[PDB]
Design a protein around this ligand. Sequence first.
Ligand SMILES: C1CC1c1nn[nH]n1
Lengths: 300, 237
Amino acid sequence: MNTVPFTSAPIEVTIGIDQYSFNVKENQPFHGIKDIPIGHVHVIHFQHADNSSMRYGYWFDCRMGNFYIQYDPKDGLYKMMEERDGAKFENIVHNFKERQMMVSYPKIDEDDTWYNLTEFVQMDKIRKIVRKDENQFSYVDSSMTTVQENELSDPAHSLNYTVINFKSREAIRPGHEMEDFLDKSYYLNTVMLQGIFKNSSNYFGELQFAFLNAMFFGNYGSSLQWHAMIELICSSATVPKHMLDKLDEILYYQIKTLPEQYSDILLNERVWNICLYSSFQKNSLHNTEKIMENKYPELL
Amino acid sequence: GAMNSSNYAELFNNDIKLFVDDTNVYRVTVHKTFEGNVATKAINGCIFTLNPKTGHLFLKIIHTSVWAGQKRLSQLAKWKTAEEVSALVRSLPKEEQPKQIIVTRKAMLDPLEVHMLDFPNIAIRPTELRLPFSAAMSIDKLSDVVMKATEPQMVLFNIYDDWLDRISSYTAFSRLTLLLRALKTNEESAKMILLSDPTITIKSYHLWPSFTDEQWITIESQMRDLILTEYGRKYNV
Ligand SMILES: C1CC1c1nn[nH]n1
């Protein structure tokens, strides 16, 4: 297990670590998070008590370095930093643990939720969507725009998701206009899977990352990307039968984890009704359809 | 965006534009089968592509062979329409290509947009005008060329005959839409009105009779009366 120490908590803040969250009071003696499961990416996220504007956070993998969080009073946020002195990091972690000033990552043993949401998410792929090459961890916030959102504005601070546009020359072969617009299989299998993503695992990784950024930061462009990536599969007549099987599992756990009170802002009625009841794959998502019908029947 | 009565003068400015009406592309008769089922039989159709400023009509005749062995014909018909309009634009010299294409039915927007991706500067727009272009097949010379076709064919007409020598495009378009609305509402009476007086004939190179300015006022009034008469019959007014 690994640890992210906090130098201090000078402002009152709700801190998230993956799907968990806790409140820290202003100047409370909080010095970090311990027992973080090795083997997954993680996200540590923040919402200030005195200004719920800008949810922000950091994607990281404890296998890639030793990271700590320190408040910057000039920029007014909690920043992630990499500790390059290992001996210092060990002493700082041990002292904070001995004084019991850390919260424990509260993982239940039966509970596979975080694996199920991040199965295909890799740090190296995150670092290509979020470009800041001098850090091993990646900052995301509520207001960052996507590359596609910007084509329709500072490119350094953008989410470089793969652009998906159903009415684009990329999606539509000349001479196959009707075919390719009504059946997205060309665009899914040749352009996206064989061409850009190289395999279904990378495609699902980006889909999962987009969902998590929408849920944890309320990032609107990430929500658009998540729905586009679902719709592209669902609107394709030809998809590897094992590929739809994994899609159903991925979506099931996303819908299961979504806060009930955020469903009105995180779920696109059009896309979901089309995917579950009208699309080529309307019968291929039994687990997702069952949870959607029992948890959010209003949307449908 | 969408085209309506507020920006109606825009139709007669100097930006080239075309209306596209697909309502006569896929045409069928419906009949009982020997077994008592029902079957359709397609008949020849046409795309109605019209420049409202000049009157030039690009009538693409859709021969029934294009449907042979095809499924979901009503859907295919929109995409064939879009394919043919796209091909027409590509066939025109650059300086004759339209800046806007206005479709009479919103179901044509995505098919035409997808076929015209290579032309990002041509705007594809719907309209809130109810345009009676479905009645084009009530113009006898148009209907005859469509029904006699034995293969796909493009035929060019000026749907305003020689009117622009004497009236503006705005007026010519209004006259056309009134004539087509009347033919749509009561075809027999409309044709009766147009041909009642044998001394006024249709030139061989025209679609409509050779009315003087005064006779056109009389005709236009009789067409309005027809439309009003039929409205009263319909609603018991
Ligand atoms: C002192 C810089 C603070 C730190 N470093 N590593 N963990 N905590």
